[PDB]
Amino acid sequence: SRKFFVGGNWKMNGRKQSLGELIGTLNAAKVPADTEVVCAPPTAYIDFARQKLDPKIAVAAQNCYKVTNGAFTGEISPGMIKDCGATWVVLGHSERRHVFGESDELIGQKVAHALAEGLRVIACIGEKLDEREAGITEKVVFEQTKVIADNVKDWSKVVLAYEPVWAIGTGKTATPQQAQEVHEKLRGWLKSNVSDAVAQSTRIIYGGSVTGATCKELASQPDVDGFLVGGASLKPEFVDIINAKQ
């Protein structure tokens, strides 16, 4: 019953010309009936991207703040994101946490506000290499997930994304089995701490390295319900990742 979920995080990449070309490819692509597709453009192009993209693709903001309006130069609110036609926001992404210092407390508050305002949330968690090697993977990801869970009432509006931050330019990489074991642990957490119905119906998506060559094996893992895709999301290869269950 869990609908396969493929998020494309464009990060800080592209211009109207190149992203227009990419959107033409995604508009033309056949999306499977069993798959939900979301694209997260740079904040300057949420509006542009929603206008050009076909309704079969939903649009996500890459981040947002925790009040509707205010003196927060450089921020955007859930209200603005909806006003541009986007229905999702990515929150707690590893880059926000570890490049820009976004705390769990702040991220939990963003989740609550985004959800209260009617957005759906891709909520990102994950451990760094020092944390994984000290043995505290479970501790880190369960705690991050708890802060998210404290600020979620309706889990039908949420997707969890596991980011193996330990495998980003570190000299280590995650196997499909290593991805699967974290994913099953997280699903057990949902069963244990909220509901068996929530555990079974919540998409837990893989946010580590995924390509067209690697996506089918990763998607076949029982507790991996799709991907939050990085670099490949800017290429036609993204459509191969959309087709990962076919």
- Point out the annotated binding site for substrate: 9, 11
How far from 109 is each of 94, 95, 102, 151, 171, CA to CA, in Å? Answer: 17, 18, 11, 7, 34
Least Cβ distance, residue 15 to its own copies (angstroms):
4
Is residue 155 a contact residue for its own copies (CB under 8 A)? Answer: no
Quick note: the x/- pattern for its own copies over 83-112, rule CB under 8 A, is xx-----x--xxxx--xxx-----------
Cβ–Cβ under 8 Å, residues 4 and 32? yes
Least Cβ distance, residue 98 to its own copies (angstroms):
11
Please tell me the distance from the alpha carbon of residue 117 to that of residue 130, in angstroms, as a whole number: 36
Least Cβ distance, residue 194 to its own copies (angstroms):
26
191 CB-near residues (< 8 Å, 6+ apart)? 198, 199
> Please, which residue, 46 or 204, has the CB nearer to its own copies?
46
Quick note: the x/- pattern for its own copies over 40-69, rule CB under 8 A, is x-xxxxxxx------------xxx-x-x-x
From the candidates 36, 93, 102, 127, give the one annotated as an active-site residue: 93
Residue for token pair 């089995």: 177
How far from 157 is each of 88, 119, 202, 227, 236, CA to CA, in Å? Answer: 9, 7, 9, 17, 28
Is residue 183 part of the annotated active site? The answer reads no
Residue for token pair 């109207």: 16
Residue 214: closest CA among 246, 242, 176: 176
> Please, which residue, 36 or 95, has the CB nearer to its own copies?
95
Report the interface residues with its own copies, using CB under 8 A: 9, 11-16, 40, 42-48, 61-63, 65, 67, 69-77, 79-81, 83-84, 90, 93-96, 99-101, 230-231
Q: Which residues are catalytic?
A: 93, 163
